[PDB]
Amino acid sequence: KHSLPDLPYDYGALEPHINAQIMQLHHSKHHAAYVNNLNVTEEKYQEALAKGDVTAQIALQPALKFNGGGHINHSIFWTNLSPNGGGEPKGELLEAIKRDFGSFDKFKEKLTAASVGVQGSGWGWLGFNKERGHLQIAACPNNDPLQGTTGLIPLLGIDVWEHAYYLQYKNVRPDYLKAIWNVINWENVTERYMACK
Amino acid sequence: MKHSLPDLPYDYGALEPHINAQIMQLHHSKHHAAYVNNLNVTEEKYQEALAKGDVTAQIALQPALKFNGGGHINHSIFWTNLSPNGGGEPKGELLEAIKRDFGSFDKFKEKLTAASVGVQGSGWGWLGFNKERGHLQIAACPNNDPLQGTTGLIPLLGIDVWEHAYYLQYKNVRPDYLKAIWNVINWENVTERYMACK
Ligand SMILES: [K+]
Ligand SMILES: [K+]
Ligand SMILES: [K+]
Ligand SMILES: [K+]
Ligand SMILES: [K+]
Ligand SMILES: [K+]
Ligand SMILES: [K+]
Ligand SMILES: [K+]
Ligand SMILES: [K+]
Ligand SMILES: [K+]
Ligand SMILES: [K+]
Ligand SMILES: [K+]
Ligand SMILES: [K+]
Ligand SMILES: [Mn+2]
Ligand SMILES: [Mn+2]
């Protein structure tokens, strides 16, 4: 049974950048539903596999990817933010950002652009490409998770579903993207990067 | 338990001159055999991932499961949908339903032909049964995506329009294959599948 992780901080800890009502809904309603539906779907898959029911396995794929991906993505996202965040990373991650994107500021522009560019629901990611040994930006639709659908290892995700920002920023997704940089937990992103090497 | 390649219920040359023996043997003994085997490999990996709660691994396996699982589902139906005893028109309640839902048998053939010719890339044309609406319905599916798993419709008749289903004999002219296949449709099987829905 997958479980809803506790947040690493309280729901208001990322104010004013992401308001407490959003964090509370996002974790306690949206992520909770992913977890609950993921568990239901995995149990149905166990049954289908035991019976050799390939039709049922395939019919369950959309629920599995959506809720499973929701669980994967949100579990990473909470750790990617912190009340003590903001600013720039240091060390090898900063070195890699400068090497692969030219500068920290150009990296921000490129992840911002990928995130603002999602049409519909989805996510922007900074990932690590293990084959190539370098950083890579990608966008993913809906809750499709980065590693399961692209092979890239997730380092930093930005949720651009409307429920991630709408109560506060309404349609103005770019204002949310500007604000979120103030709460990036570069410690966590660095840990994820260093685990890849 | 493991999925198995069903034997083809007739000789590889039983459908000549409509589908030749070289196609039938490659399609069954090479293409379908590979789907079954790859499906069983993917299922095994999926069980492991599920036991470990590895959702990333489950999602990464979805393309192979749908493609090879769908391949197994669709080809298993297809072999039974063809017969040397086939061709002609169905009878009874299936014919009545075709006339009711499509206007006539020939109109139905045109619509299923159009759906099958219209696949861009690899895929299948299907006649299915919509259990909720209680009537027949035509759909096209990409690659090996299977009808029931992706649409909920119950498959009655499938036509494979992957190039391996026809290319050796008909080359690029997919409409020549589709003309030919009507001569070997096993309407007895299609009828059985339809009656099982009702
Ligand atoms: K907050
Ligand atoms: K703000
Ligand atoms: K988790
Ligand atoms: K540089
Ligand atoms: K999704
Ligand atoms: K958010
Ligand atoms: K079998
Ligand atoms: K013969
Ligand atoms: K497929
Ligand atoms: K069926
Ligand atoms: K064929
Ligand atoms: K011919
Ligand atoms: K012909
Ligand atoms: Mn979200
Ligand atoms: Mn085929």
Author numbering:
A (entry chain B): 1 to 197
B (entry chain A): 0 to 197
Authors' own words:
Human manganese superoxide dismutase (MnSOD) is a mitochondrial matrix metalloenzyme that catalyzes the dismutation of reactive superoxide radicals, generated as byproducts of mitochondrial respiration, into molecular oxygen (O2) and hydrogen peroxide (H2O2). As the only known mitochondrial enzyme capable of converting reactive radicals into diffusible products that can be further metabolized or exported, MnSOD serves as the critical first line of defence against oxidative stress. In the wild-type enzyme, Gln143 mediates proton transfers with the manganese-bound solvent (WAT1) to drive redox cycling of the metal, which is necessary for effective superoxide dismutation. Substitution with Asn stalls catalysis because the increased distance from WAT1 disrupts critical proton-coupled electron-transfer (PCET) events, and the redox cycling of the active-site metal is impaired.
In addition to H2O2 binding at the canonical LIG and PEO sites in the treated Gln143Asn enzyme, our results reveal a striking accumulation of five distinct cryo-trapped H2O2 molecules, either fully or partially occupying the space between the solvent-exposed enzyme surface and the Tyr34–His30 solvent gate. These new bulk-exposed peroxides, named Lb for Ligbulk binding sites, identified in this study have never been observed in any other peroxide-soaked MnSOD. To validate that the observed Lb densities truly correspond to H2O2 molecules, rather than misassigned or mobile waters, we performed a trial refinement in which we replaced each Lb peroxide in the treated structure with a fully occupied water molecule, as in the resting state. However, this does not satisfy the electron density, as shown by the appearance of positive Fo − Fc difference density around one of the missing O atoms in the trial structure. In addition to the Lb H2O2 molecules on the solvent-exposed surface, we observe H2O2 binding at the metal-ligated LIG position and at the PEO position at the mouth of the active-site solvent-funnel gateway between second-shell residues Tyr34 and His30. Overall, H2O2 treatment does not appear to significantly alter the active-site architecture of Gln143Asn MnSOD, except for the partial displacement of the manganese-bound solvent (WAT1) by a partially occupied (∼35%) H2O2 molecule bound at the LIG position, opposite His26.
